[PDB]
From a paper:
We focused our attention on human RAD51, an ATP-dependent recombinase crucial for homologous recombination (HR) and for error-free repair of DNA double-strand breaks. We therefore explored the possibility of using a more stable orthologue as a surrogate and focused our efforts on archeal RadA from Pyrococcus furiosus, a protein that was already structurally characterised and is closely related to human RAD51. Here, we describe the complete process of generating robust, RAD51-like surrogate systems from this archeal protein via two distinct approaches: by stepwise mutation of the surface of the RadA to humanise the BRC4 binding area (HumRadA series of mutants) and by generating an archeal/human chimera (ChimRAD51) in which all of the BRC4 binding part of RAD51 is stabilised by parts of RadA.
Therefore, we proceeded with a stepwise humanisation of the LFDE site and validated the resulting mutants using biophysical methods (as described in the next section). HumRadA14 represents a “turning point” of the humanisation process as it is the first mutant to show detectable binding to BRC4 peptides, due to a combination of fine-tuning at the LFDE site and further re-shaping of the Phe pocket (mutations V168A157 and W170Y179). The structures of those mutants, where the LFDE site has been humanised (HumRadA14 and 22), show good correlation with the human BRC4–RAD51 complex in this area for the backbone but some variation in the side-chain conformations. Despite extensive efforts, we were unable to obtain a crystal structure of a complex of a HumRadA mutant with a BRC repeat, and differences in the BRC4 binding site are likely to reflect the unliganded state of our proteins.
Author numbering: 109 to 248, 255 to 284, 309 to 349
Write the structure that this text describes.
């Protein structure tokens, strides 16, 4: 049974078929400021909510490769969603990735953390990798070896722990993001085999992301 995490946006959830799916890797790509990082932050809060509110009562793991994680943004999203910001921050496991090899290494200390948490009322239900390729790009056919291997460990983790894997870039589900007018963002499903290739409009607000 696939679990779905609400993005915060009805329009975006509809395009995704209800939300980002567990046992799958959602890959969101676009230029900087396109909403990819705002969506990752909103998901780290949403996952924590009960299923009736668009969550999976789960914990989140935020792997950061380019200093994109902002706890005061988590605080804001949580506050404006009527949650305790301190409790929300508590169930978001932040790990910084210093290079591609350490990035892959973190998947293993993600597994260790996911086991200890499995028999709790808040097991991990989301693993964010913001961004997937930055270290691979800046360090290197080869690099293409070490990449599709990293994606393999991500899949193992998604199936192994019934977690949604959410990656940003510039797999399962590729979503192209772009800025719109005025401060709106536009999403577009790419090569989706089970969903139609439409578009959805969403806003970056105080609640993270919404219509």
């Amino acid at each position: 049974t696939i679990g779905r995490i609400s993005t915060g946006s009805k329009s975006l959830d509809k395009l995704l078929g209800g939300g980002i799916e567990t046992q799958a890797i959602t890959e969101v790509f676009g230029e900087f400021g396109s909403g990819k990082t705002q969506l990752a932050h909103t998901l780290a809060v949403m996952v924590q909510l009960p299923p009736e509110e668009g969550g999976l009562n789960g914990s989140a793991m935020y792997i950061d490769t380019e200093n994109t994680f902002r706890p005061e943004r988590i605080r804001e999203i949580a506050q404006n969603r009527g949650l305790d910001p301190d409790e929300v921050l508590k169930h978001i496991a932040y790990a910084r990735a210093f290079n591609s090899n350490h990035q892959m290494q973190l998947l293993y200390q993600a597994s260790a953390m996911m086991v200890e948490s499995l028999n709790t009322d808040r097991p991990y239900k989301l693993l964010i990798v913001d961004s997937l390729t930055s270290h691979f790009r800046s360090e290197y056919a080869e690099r293409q070896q070490k990449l599709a291997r990293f994606l393999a460990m991500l899949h193992r983790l998604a199936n192994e722990f019934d977690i949604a894997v959410f990656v940003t870039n510039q797999a399962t589900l590729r979503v192209y993001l772009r800025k719109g007018k005025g401060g709106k963002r536009i999403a577009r499903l790419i090569d989706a085999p089970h969903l139609p290739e439409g578009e959805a409009v969403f806003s970056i607000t105080e609640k993270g992301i919404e219509d």
